[PDB]
Amino acid sequence: MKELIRKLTEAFGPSGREEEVRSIILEELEGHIDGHRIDGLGNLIVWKGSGEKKVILDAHIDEIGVVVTNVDDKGFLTIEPVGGVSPYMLLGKRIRFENGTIGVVGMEGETTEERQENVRKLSFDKLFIDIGANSREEAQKMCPIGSFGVYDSGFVEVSGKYVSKAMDDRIGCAVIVEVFKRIKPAVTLYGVFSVQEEVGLVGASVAGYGVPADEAIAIDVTDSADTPKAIKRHAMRLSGGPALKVKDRASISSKRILENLIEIAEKFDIKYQMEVLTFGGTNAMGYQRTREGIPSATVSIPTRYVHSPSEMIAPDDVEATVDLLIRYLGA
């Protein structure tokens, strides 16, 4: 699965500009799906099988990023976050823009005391991007206002863990692709690779509309609270298996679906952990609220350092999640 994960995480796909991710996913799926369509928002919907029960598996293909809001006379850029990227994460980091341009993030401060105050209260107003331009005109040629960027960081293996940008939610995309590659479905299986989750769960809010699903299961990342002084109320851990989301701020999972997943996990002795998340949301909310309502749940990959350029996952949890879905939906 490593190469698939490496390819998807490194691909350029911030919210609203996910086309490259969608294409890579389509290619990977060729020969493993019966059909597909791409809707108006850019959601990729694929299907395999002919079983009576219809199930959606959803993962979002957008990642967090930045967008250029202004250019000054000397050619430095200002940016606005796309999704929940912290300004503290950006300091001294490199940004990769859609056209391949690389920029360096710098912070303002006319005095050492001002720099010290700025970092104590960091905001995007105090940040800028240097793309090597020497004038406004030159910067506009390379990266005009409205240009999107992502972390300039890639996949690397760290003593058996995988580290990359955009585990959120390329790791989810990889899980679902892998399910389609392997499964002989007992259900009619719908794969939705949805846009713009990071800016309001937008794609999954409509992707369900044209899909007659009995169930929707969102696959996403969750907080692995096993680091020093981790979020105390969060129980999730690396290598603890798939995390079955009881609740987060966006949704409460269908009890019936969780019980099914739990029974499946116990029967096949798949390691799993229960999740209640005290912040954040997932695409499950979108399917839940579509039409007359699709009962929905979330299965999560425990991930360290979410929204950093070095998100970390345990490959055993990913495999177990693909296994759990396969046992639940087929063979």
Distance CA 324, CA 302 (A): 15
Q: Shortest gap between Cβ of 184 and a second copy (angstroms)?
A: 27
**C-beta neighbour count of 257 within 10 angstroms:** 21
Contact 56, 294 (CB under 8 A): yes
Identify the CA nearest to 265 among candidates 223, 176, 326. Answer: 326
- Answer for which of 84, 104, 260, 315 binds a second copy (CB under 8 A) is 104
Question: Which residue in the list 18, 63, 178, 197 is annotated as catalytic?
Answer: 197
Interaction of residue 145 with a second copy, rule CB under 8 A: yes
Judged by DSSP in three states, 256 sits in helix
Chain residues 287-316 in contact with a second copy, contact rule CB under 8 A: 288-295, 304-305, 308-310, 312
Identify the CA nearest to 238 among candidates 183, 155, 171. Answer: 171
Supply 10's token pair. 């490194």
Q: Which residues on neighbouring strands pair with residue 229, listed in sequence order?
A: none
To the question of whether residue 307 is assigned a binding role by annotation, the answer is yes
Judged by DSSP in three states, 317 sits in helix
Task: Please identify, using beta-carbon distances, which residue of 53 and 293 lies nearer to a second copy.
Answer: 293
Among the candidate windows 53-61, 177-185, 250-258, 263-271, which touches a second copy by CB under 8 A?
Answer: 250-258
Among the candidate windows 5-13, 124-132, 184-192, 322-330, which touches a second copy by CB under 8 A?
Answer: 124-132
Supply 108's token pair. 């303002």
- Answer for which of 30, 35, 52, 120 binds a second copy (CB under 8 A) is 120
Q: Shortest gap between Cβ of 301 and a second copy (angstroms)?
A: 16
Contact 211, 190 (CB under 8 A): yes
Among the candidate windows 23-31, 51-59, 182-190, 232-240, which touches a second copy by CB under 8 A?
Answer: 232-240
Q: What is the DSSP letter of 72?
A: -
Interaction of residue 112 with a second copy, rule CB under 8 A: yes
Per the annotation, the verdict on 157 as an active-site residue is: no
How many residues sit in the footprint of a second copy (CB under 8 A)? 111
- Answer for which of 31, 40, 100, 331 binds a second copy (CB under 8 A) is 40
Interaction of residue 69 with a second copy, rule CB under 8 A: yes
- Answer for which of 3, 30, 35, 88 binds a second copy (CB under 8 A) is 88
Tell me the C-alpha to C-alpha distance, in Å, between residue 322 and each of 107, 158, 176, 248, 318. Answer: 42, 22, 7, 22, 6
Judged by DSSP in three states, 10 sits in helix
To the question of whether residue 198 is assigned a binding role by annotation, the answer is yes
Contact 223, 231 (CB under 8 A): yes
Task: Please identify, using beta-carbon distances, which residue of 296 and 321 lies nearer to a second copy.
Answer: 296
- Answer for which of 23, 255, 266, 268 binds a second copy (CB under 8 A) is 255
Going by the annotation, the residues of the binding site for Zn(2+) are 60, 168, 197-198, 220, 307
